[PDB]
Amino acid sequence: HVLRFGGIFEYVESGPMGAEELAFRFAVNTINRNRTLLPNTTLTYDTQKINLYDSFEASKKACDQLSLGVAAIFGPSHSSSANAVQSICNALGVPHIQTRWKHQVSDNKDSFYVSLYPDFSSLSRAILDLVQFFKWKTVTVVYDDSTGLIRLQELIKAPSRYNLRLKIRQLPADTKDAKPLLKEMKRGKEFHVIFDCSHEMAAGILKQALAMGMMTEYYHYIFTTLDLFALDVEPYRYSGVNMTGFRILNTENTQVSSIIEKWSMERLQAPPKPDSGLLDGFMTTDAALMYDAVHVVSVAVQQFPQMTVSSLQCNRHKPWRFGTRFMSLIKEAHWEGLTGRITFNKTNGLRTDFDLDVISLKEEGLEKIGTWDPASGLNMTESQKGKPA
Amino acid sequence: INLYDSFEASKKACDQLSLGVAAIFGPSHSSSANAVQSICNALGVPHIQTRWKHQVSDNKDSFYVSLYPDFSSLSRAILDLVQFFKWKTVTVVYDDSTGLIRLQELIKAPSRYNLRLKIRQLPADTKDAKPLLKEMKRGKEFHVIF
Amino acid sequence: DCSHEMAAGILKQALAMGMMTEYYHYIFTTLDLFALDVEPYRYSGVNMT
Ligand SMILES: *[C@@H]1O[C@H](CO)[C@@H](O[C@@H]2O[C@H](CO)[C@@H](O[C@H]3O[C@H](CO[C@H]4O[C@H](CO)[C@@H](O)[C@H](O)[C@@H]4O)[C@@H](O)[C@H](O[C@H]4O[C@H](CO)[C@@H](O)[C@H](O)[C@@H]4O)[C@@H]3O)[C@H](O)[C@H]2NC(C)=O)[C@H](O)[C@H]1NC(C)=O
Ligand SMILES: *[C@@H]1O[C@H](CO)[C@@H](O)[C@H](O)[C@H]1NC(C)=O
Ligand SMILES: *[C@@H]1O[C@H](CO)[C@@H](O)[C@H](O)[C@H]1NC(C)=O
Ligand SMILES: *[C@@H]1O[C@H](CO)[C@@H](O)[C@H](O)[C@H]1NC(C)=O
Numbered sequence: 001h002v003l004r005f006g007g008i009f010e011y012v013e014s015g016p017m018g019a020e021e022l023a024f025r026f027a028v029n030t031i032n033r034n035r036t037l038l039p040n041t042t043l044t045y046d047t048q049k050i051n052l053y054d055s056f057e058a059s060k061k062a063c064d065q066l067s068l069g070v071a072a073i074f075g076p077s078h079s080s081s082a083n084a085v086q087s088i089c090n091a092l093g094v095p096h097i098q099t100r101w102k103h104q105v106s107d108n109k110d111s112f113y114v115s116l117y118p119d120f121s122s123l124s125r126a127i128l129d130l131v132q133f134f135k136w137k138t139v140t141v142v143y144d145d146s147t148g149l150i151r152l153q154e155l156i157k158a159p160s161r162y163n164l165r166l167k168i169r170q171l172p173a174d175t176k177d178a179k180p181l182l183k184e185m186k187r188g189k190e191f192h193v194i195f196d197c198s199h200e201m202a203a204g205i206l207k208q209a210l211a212m213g214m215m216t217e218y219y220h221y222i223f224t225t226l227d228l229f230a231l232d233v234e235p236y237r238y239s240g241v242n243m244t245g246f247r248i249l250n251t252e253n254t255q256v257s258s259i260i261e262k263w264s265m266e267r268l269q270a271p272p273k274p275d276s277g278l279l280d281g282f283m284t285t286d287a288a289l290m291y292d293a294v295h296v297v298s299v300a301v302q303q304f305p306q307m308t309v310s311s312l313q314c315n316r317h318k319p320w321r322f323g324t325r326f327m328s329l330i331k332e333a334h335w336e337g338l339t340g341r342i343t344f345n346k347t348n349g350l351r352t353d354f355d356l357d358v359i360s361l362k363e364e365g366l367e368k369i370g371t372w373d374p375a376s377g378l379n380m381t382e383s384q385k386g387k388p389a
Numbered sequence: 390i391n392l393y394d395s396f397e398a399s400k401k402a403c404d405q406l407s408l409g410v411a412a413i414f415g416p417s418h419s420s421s422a423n424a425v426q427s428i429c430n431a432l433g434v435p436h437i438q439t440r441w442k443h444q445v446s447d448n449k450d451s452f453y454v455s456l457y458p459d460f461s462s463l464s465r466a467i468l469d470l471v472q473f474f475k476w477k478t479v480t481v482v483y484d485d486s487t488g489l490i491r492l493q494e495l496i497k498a499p500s501r502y503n504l505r506l507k508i509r510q511l512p513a514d515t516k517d518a519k520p521l522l523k524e525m526k527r528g529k530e531f532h533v534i535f
Numbered sequence: 536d537c538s539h540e541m542a543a544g545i546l547k548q549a550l551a552m553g554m555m556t557e558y559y560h561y562i563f564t565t566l567d568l569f570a571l572d573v574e575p576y577r578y579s580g581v582n583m584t
Contacts, residue, residue: 055427063411087395213555213579239553
């Protein structure tokens with residue numbers, strides 16, 4: 001048996017394609033081999049290359065894929081294109097997967113989509129638990145673009161409950177012009193910084209702060225990104241700095257590291273950039289989310305054997321006859337992947353339960369110092385250091 | 390047009406441009422206006438937006454105008470009013486998260502002056518303002534902006 | 536008190552050790568201070584003389 005998926009990827013001109021497409025093709029190859037699941041059915045796909053930051057081209061490619069006939073469209077990363085693809089697949093009833101966080105409209109009435117990216121409400125309360133553990137009074141939150149203010153909503157609302165002083169600054173459009181901003185932060189004399197940006201932006205900010213001579217024993221940085229292992233701590237390890245972040249890729253598991261070395265040769269197929277200050281040979285988190293997304297789609301479609309793909313039409317409003325049952329089978333599968341266990345909130349379809357672990361910069365590198373959970377709060381080995389009778 | 394349906398707005402815009410018009414005065418909701426703006430920017434037809442929507446910082450569309458006042462200038466006017474009134478502690482109360490996009494200069498203004506900020510969000514329904522007003526009275530501050 | 540090559544080496548090691556603050560003041564007895572790279576330390580607020 002055969003089954004086709006819908007892949008939409010915002011491509012880059014020249015070089016290799018995006019790492020999400022590499023993870024998608026590698027994951028399809030590892031489902032087409034290694035017969036743990038899907039014995040009677042093989043999986044094919046169809047990838048399209050759409051324009052960066054456009055939604056009409058995304059709608060055209062989604063209608064081309066739906067006229068071709070797919071099982072589930074794997075949506076893009078940009079917010080407006082994901083909104084358009086969410087609208088068309090909601091109107092046609094085809095299930096949708098998001099590997100990237102988008103701004104959720106509160107009064108939107110859609111139910112034909114899931115997003116395996118962790119919710120920033122739970123991430124924001126994880127940051128709140130970490131800043132409550134460190135006993136801070138004045139903190140400065142630095143973001144890059146305005147939508148991050150949506151992503152740190154509970155951090156903004158948290159001075160209404162505690163005695164936490166909080167200042168907020170925005171990084172400029174030019175990535176190398178942080179020197180006035182870091183000069184102002186050095187003049188203001190704050191030593192408690194929460195950065196909210198991508199890992200490449202965080203690497204550029206950290207390098208320009210090293211050129212600023214900022215980080216010491218006094219300063220302390222908390223990064224909201226989940227790609228802290230992509231950075232190199234070689235020019236920052238011996239300076240006594242307490243960079244702290246969150247992780248979701250449980251590299252302690254052996255099969256996870258097997259996936260790491262299975263993706264390492266395709267990573268080094270693309271040339272690295274040593275000037276960027278990024279450690280090559282490591283998974284970005286969205287590739288792991290795409291891997292776990294198509295794996296949980298695979299274990300959901302394994303339970304449904306009568307999956308027939310119909311070439312639906314955008315110009316008509318005839319929904320798929322299997323879309324409701326397939327979505328109501330997707331929305332509860334407890335597949336164990338590279339991001340820990342995967343569960344979906346049944347109210348909205350957003351991933352709100354996960355097992356992060358907090359990492360910190362030690363003198364030997366980045367080490368795991370604890371574990372965050374939504375129900376269990378924040379248990380860590382440092383708090384359980386002194387436990388006498 | 391239906392409530393919050395970007396594909397329906399896309400289909401109506403396609404049918405209307407197949408009928409042929411000069412310019413389109415699009416919807417009042419942000420996602421459908423974004424889809425209609427992208428479609429008419431791809432097809433060259435001008436767009437006129439009445440209500441403010443969130444602008445993506447790196448969208449290269451140039452076939453659209455907006456007639457709501459820009460919320461950066463509104464935030465600067467609000468900050469001018471607050472700095473005229475000589476205040477220290479304020480409570481920003483919003484309902485939709487895009488208001489945090491709208492009043493971003495007011496949140497950045499503690500880096501400028503010695504302004505104390507308390508920011509609260511109204512609940513999902515409309516009749517449950519009373520617990521927020523009870524928390525407002527119990528928090529013992531008076532300068533409230535909505 | 537060293538050569539300018541050892542001065543560049545000890546300056547890179549001091550940058551890696553977080554010595555490049557406003558507190559630290561450095562005096563070099565070598566006469567080749569323009570031979571050193573002025574770029575990665577001139578924004579750190581150090582006092583090199
Ligand atoms: C599916 O999505 C739902 C989204 O609506 C999830 O509901 C949300 O659940 C979280 C986690 O339980 C809630 O988080 C926290 O807030 C409560 C306090 O709210 C209390 O005050 C509110 C006042 O308006 C009420 O609305 C609440 O119902 C309740 O009256 C805290 O008690 C929680 O605390 C954890 O954190 C604090 C420190 O901050 C500790 O004191 C606690 O002991 C514990 O350590 C949370 O902070 C959230 O309120 C809730 N609702 C939303 C977002 O609207 C739902 O859980 C989710 N389900 C699954 C399965 O994923
Ligand atoms: C920073 O790290 C040191 C050693 O790792 C630790 O003793 C200290 O408590 C940390 N925090 C601060 C604020 O210095
Ligand atoms: C997590 O919490 C449990 C008890 O709640 C504790 O036994 C365990 O040691 C904690 N994990 C770590 C890494 O400290
Ligand atoms: C460093 O030089 C500045 C002048 O630029 C001076 O104000 C400051 O006191 C000096 N600091 C030390 C530690 O010598």
